[PDB]
Every structure is written in C-alpha cells, then in structure tokens.
Design a protein around this ligand. Structure first.
Ligand SMILES: Nc1ncnc2c1ncn2[C@@H]1O[C@H](COP(=O)(O)OP(=O)(O)NP(=O)(O)O)[C@@H](O)[C@H]1O
Ligand SMILES: Nc1ncnc2c1ncn2[C@@H]1O[C@H](COP(=O)(O)OP(=O)(O)NP(=O)(O)O)[C@@H](O)[C@H]1O
Ligand SMILES: [Mg+2]
Ligand SMILES: [Mg+2]
Lengths: 352, 361
C-alpha cells in the first residue's frame, strides 16, 4: 500500500515536520522527523507575513532556503529509515504561508515545489489551498476531511481540536456531515506575548501562564471581541483601555482566553461530546490542557496520543494524505467547512 | 488524437495568445484567438516588473484579473469552435513573467493555475521554467525543443523576435543549441512609447524614415551581454529604457527617428553576429513572433545574413504570431507524456527534465 511523505511548516514557525505514512485502507505513521526552524529564516519568513518592499525577490530567496532545508530533512529521514526515494510515491507539501486573505480571494504558500522535486527525486504535490479559494472558499482548514477518515467512529461524538497558532476543531458526530470552524487563538497570543516580553518562542508547559493570576476585566473584554459573534498590537490595543497589569497575569489571561473560546464554541455546537481529541503543539501546553479538562468536565479531554497518533504529527500526516487524495482524484476539501462551492481536487503535481 | 490549448502572454504585453492544437504524428494548429491586453492590466504588470511595495498582494490581485481575461478567452474560442472543454486534454499556460533572474536562481511567472482550472474546467499545465532553473538552467528559451520537433539535411535557424530575440540552431547531427540574442521589439517599442503614445512602431515605418547613428550604434553593441557565449537569458544586461537614456546622455543630442533607426539596427546586428558566430553554415533563417511583421527589420536581417534565406514561418505553414502559444500547448503534451521539455545545452541545466505542474480540473 502506497507510501507518502508529508511536509508541514505551520505559522507558529517552530520547525518543519516530515512524516512517512502508509495509505492502505488505513493511514499509518511509519516515521517522523523534526527540523527546528533556524533563527534567521524564521524572522525572514515573519517579515514576509506583512506588506513590505521587494517582496517577490525576497520571497524567492527565502523559498530557496526553506526548500533546501525541507530537502535536507527528507533525505536525512530516508537514509535513517534505509529507504530509496523511489519507495515514496509523492511528497505532500503544505509549503509556508506568508499571506492568507480569503476576503481578497488569495492565499500564498511559498515553497518552490519544483526545486523540492529536483532535490528529493520524489514527485511533489503542493499548493493545496488555492483551488478551494478559487471555488469561493476560505482555503482552510483542510484537515477536517482527514480527521473524519482517521477517526470514523459511528458511536461517540468525537471532537478533534488542533491548537497551533489558531484553534480549529473538527466535530465528528455519528452519521452526519463533518463540521468545522475556528474556535479562536491557540498558541498565537501566548507565543506573541512571551516573545515580546522576554524573547522566548513559546511558554514551555504553560508554566509562565500558570504562575500568573487571571485578570477578569481584561478577560471579559477579550472574550467580548466581535470575532466570537489576534496579533500583539491587537492585544496591546486592549492593554491600553485597562489597568497596567503584571506580565504573568496577561499570560494567564491569554491562556484563559484560548481555553474559554475553545470551550464555549465546542459544546455550543456538539454539547454531548464524549471525546475531545487534542492535536498540535498546544497539546504540550499542560497548563492549557488542564483548563480545557475542567471547562469540559463531562467530556474526556486528551491528545490524539490516547487514540494512537502523536499530536505533533497530525497536520504532517494530513498533507501526506492530501497528496494521496490528489493522485487518486478524490476531493481534499470539505465545502460545508470551507464555504467552497463544492468538492475540489486540491493541489498541483510537480513530477521528479 | 489529443487536443491542447496554449496560453501565451510575453514580455511585450501586447495581449494574450490563445491557440488550440491537435497533437498526433505532428502538431497541427486548429484555431487562434487573440485578446488585446487592457491598458489597465498592461501597466499593472509593468508595475510588477521592477522591485516595489506590497508586491505579493499586488501581484495576487493582478493575477486574478489576468486569469479572468484568459478564461474568458478560452471559453470564447471553444464556443466559437463549437467544442466543449471536455474535448481539450489540457491548457499549456506560460503565465506572465514579472521577474526573471536566473543569476539569482529564480523566475516568477504569475497566472494562478488553480483558478484557471476552476474557470475553464480544463486541466492546466503551468509553471514550466522553474524545474529547469532548479536544475541549474536559465529557464529560457523553452521553445527550442518545439522548434526542433516542428522544423528539425537543412541547417536551420528558427528566430523568435518578441520583446527579445531567441534563436534555435538546428544543426543536423549536433545537439539543439541556441540562446537569447537580445533586443527584438523591446527597445523600439519603449522609445516610440516614450516619445509618443503608441506601444509599437507599426511596420518599422518610424524607424525607416530616420537614419541610423553609427556612434550610438557602436556603443550599445559595446555591452557585456553581447559577447557572452552559450547559455544566456536576456537580462545579463537588462535592455530597457533607463539603459538607453544613459547611453543617449553620454552622446550629443539626436533626432527621435534616428534613435529609432539605430535601435532597429541594434536588433538586426546582435542577431546576425550571435547567430552567425554559432552557425555560419546556416541556410534558412525562420522568423516568428511580432518582429516578423516589421518590414524594415526583416529586409535588414536579410542583408546582414546574405548566405541564407530569411523568411517568416508562414511560408512553412505556421503563422508567426502563434508559434509561442503552440509551444506551450506542446509543453503540456510533453508534461503529460513525461517527455523532456528543456534542451539542456540551450538552457545550461544539469540535464533533461519534465517541465511544469498539473492543476487538474
Ligand atoms: N512543551 C510545550 N509547551 C508549551 N507550548 C508548546 C510546547 N511544545 C509546543 N508548544 C506550542 O506549540 C506550537 C507549535 O504548534 P504547531 O501545531 O506546530 O503550530 P503551527 O506550526 O502554527 N501549525 P498550525 O496549527 O497549522 O498553524 C509552539 O509554537 C508552541 O506554542
Ligand atoms: N505590424 C507590426 N509592425 C511592427 N512591429 C510589430 C507589428 N505587430 C507587432 N509588432 C511587434 O511585435 C511585438 C509583439 O511580439 P510578441 O512575439 O507577441 O512578443 P512577446 O511574446 O510579448 N515577447 P516575449 O516574451 O519575448 O515572447 C509588439 O510589441 C511589436 O513590437
Ligand atoms: Mg509547527
Ligand atoms: Mg506577445
């Protein structure tokens, strides 16, 4: 049964996930490999995520470094697994988003797929998002179709919660269409605050947020944002029209904002939820997971580890799956979730 | 007997070329459809050809407008030809080049292929240059492979004169060679557009009136791009208006029409010398692209290359205008048959590669 590579680099810019999957009747993880994002490239990618000068030249250079890194990591992984390139049918690559504007009908994932094919000797499928957007959709999330396949329990009301930058959920309710929406911010404000404040990337184990006192006025104002009816300056805006607060108290609050936006949105739509299956790097924020567990007391909260699949690799595995879907010519979007006009074949094929 | 669509919009920005071919034991042109480029889009594309602010959003918005006009074109041609999209195996889309810098190992062509597949309901092969650039090449010219399959006894020179000029050298026995000679219409277009409104000197009429200036002529040739042998893509020196005005400034003042006449000569000469250097045995010079409807330039190339016959491709049963478009339709065929697209000694890439990517309907 065919073998696929998945290449994920999310907008938290933490590193590159590479997965080896096998796609029979079952998806299965054969191996995984993590490339921590180097300091220079992270900041360079970051500086492409806002409008600025000379972007086309600059994106071309960044792209080349990103791809050389991806290709380095693919090779590393194959060698370590004792596999030839030709044992892999294709790479499913997400690329790297530097712009996502579904209101202006565009989304931009750099990733020179053609160089990746050149450097790996493997067929690449990339540029998954643009066809959904071309079809009247948001081009995101793409994971809900994959969640359904991978968890097809026509018994329990499972809910699959990805906490990266942003929290997004896939509600699997026996004998119905899957649903999907964005809860709100995941790690993105928590990273942003402890980055602004100290220079750190994230708040390991939710330790800094746990050492602080929740502010309720700030929290109430945050939760009252229109979205529910998300960058540092947005949060510096809210910090204006309140008392000055200790740094930890803002982190604590930010962590509560994440946990409550999740909680309300998920029992508001699937109130009889047996299992919340957490995946993504927010699964490792023990402190946030504690709070999710309390605000969902009569539901079992845990990572996808409990049901067989490590949470850090979920998204990596999904893009491997989308390569498979592309080549089998089977829809990769869920239009109900994306707003697309219907089922679309997602991606393009760059043959080795 | 597969049919393919070819979509071309070159650096001259005259408009979009849409061609339909049948690929069998050879390539037959079935239909042509030309779209004039809206003056809005033309200037917005030109605005993306130099470094600038907010290029990602800008180009993404320009691309939407470009794809909308391309699909409108495809839909019109199909209807007018009484065929449905199902009858077409694929569109070969060149996109629109906004930045070509092989020396920085990148080429950027826009024209959102996913949205093109969405709007036409036809599979799209796009983004042909990037694999060749990825494997060390210049990413251009890509037409030689096609020129060879069309017109491959005879030592032939197949000459495209668009914005720039490129020559395929079809030497019986030896590998297919060739390179960007340099300026075709680009400078003559730009001078008559600086001086006056219009985007090109119809028939070489303005140029013919004027008289060449040998001092200016001698200088422009004196340039670093021209002496370079083998794999080269125009832009080792960017032939553009700022390039010329500089040269104008270091000489005394001259009439406009003389400058045009000199520009005309510069294209004729760079072609001659670069072409003859590499193939003095050349017997026929087959000329395509819009430069072939320039009467002056054509008559002048004849003279500069006496030992061979200089005729446009219509006399070999292919209209000059549609040669590039047919080549991108043919590249979609090659992609779909997994047959090489580049000629590596032309491009200077490591070896043969299948070019492009598939965005399926
Ligand atoms: N031990 C940990 N403690 C706390 N937070 C952690 C820990 N490990 C990872 N994280 C968080 O998880 C984030 C990365 O999660 P990840 O799922 O890779 O996000 P992403 O790359 O943005 N993908 P996406 O969800 O597609 O946007 C990091 O930036 C941290 O905020
Ligand atoms: N009647 C004419 N007389 C003289 N020149 C003409 C005439 N018609 C077209 N041209 C020239 O031909 C050019 C267009 O040629 P074309 O082959 O379409 O260029 P292009 O494809 O945009 N460039 P490139 O990217 O190098 O292929 C125009 O810009 C004019 O300079
Ligand atoms: Mg990540
Ligand atoms: Mg043209």
């Amino acid at each position: 049964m065919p073998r696929y590579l998945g290449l994920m680099s999310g907008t938290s810019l933490d590193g590159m996930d590479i997965v080896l999957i096998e796609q029979g009747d079952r998806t299965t993880l054969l191996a995984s490999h993590y490339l921590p994002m180097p300091a220079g490239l992270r900041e360079d990618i970051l500086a492409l995520c806002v409008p600025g000068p000379d972007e086309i030249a600059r994106a071309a250079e960044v792209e080349q470094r990103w791809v050389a890194l991806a290709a380095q990591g693919v090779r590393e992984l194959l060698l370590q697994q004792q596999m030839s390139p030709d044992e892999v049918r294709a790479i499913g690559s997400h690329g790297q988003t530097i712009r996502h504007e579904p209101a202006r009908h565009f989304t931009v994932q750099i990733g020179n797929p053609a160089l990746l094919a050149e450097l790996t000797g493997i067929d690449v499928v990339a540029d998954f998002r643009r066809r959904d957007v071309a079809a009247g959709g948001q081009g995101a999330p793409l994971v809900p179709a994959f969640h359904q396949a991978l968890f097809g329990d026509d018994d329990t009301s499972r809910a699959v919660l990805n906490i990266g930058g942003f929290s997004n959920v896939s509600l699997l309710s026996p004998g119905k269409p899957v649903r999907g929406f964005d809860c709100g911010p995941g790690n993105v404000l928590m990273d942003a605050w402890i980055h602004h404040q100290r220079g750190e990337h994230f708040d390991r184990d939710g330790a800094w947020a746990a050492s602080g006192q929740v502010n309720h006025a700030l929290l109430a104002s945050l939760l009252a944002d229109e979205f529910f009816a998300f960058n540092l300056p947005w949060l510096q805006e809210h910090l204006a029209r309140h008392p000055a607060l200790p740094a930890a108290d803002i982190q604590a609050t930010l962590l509560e904002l994440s946990a409550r936006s999740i909680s309300e949105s998920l029992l508001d739509a699937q109130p009889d939820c047996e299992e919340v299956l957490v995946c993504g790097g927010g699964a490792f924020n023990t402190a946030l997971m504690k709070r999710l567990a309390m605000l969902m007391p009569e539901a079992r909260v845990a990572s996808t580890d409990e049901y067989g699949i490590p949470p850090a690799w979920m998204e990596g595995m999904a893009f491997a799956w989308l390569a498979h879907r592309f080549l089998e010519r089977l829809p990769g979007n869920c239009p109900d979730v994306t707003g697309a006009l219907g089922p679309r074949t997602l991606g393009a094929l760059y043959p080795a």
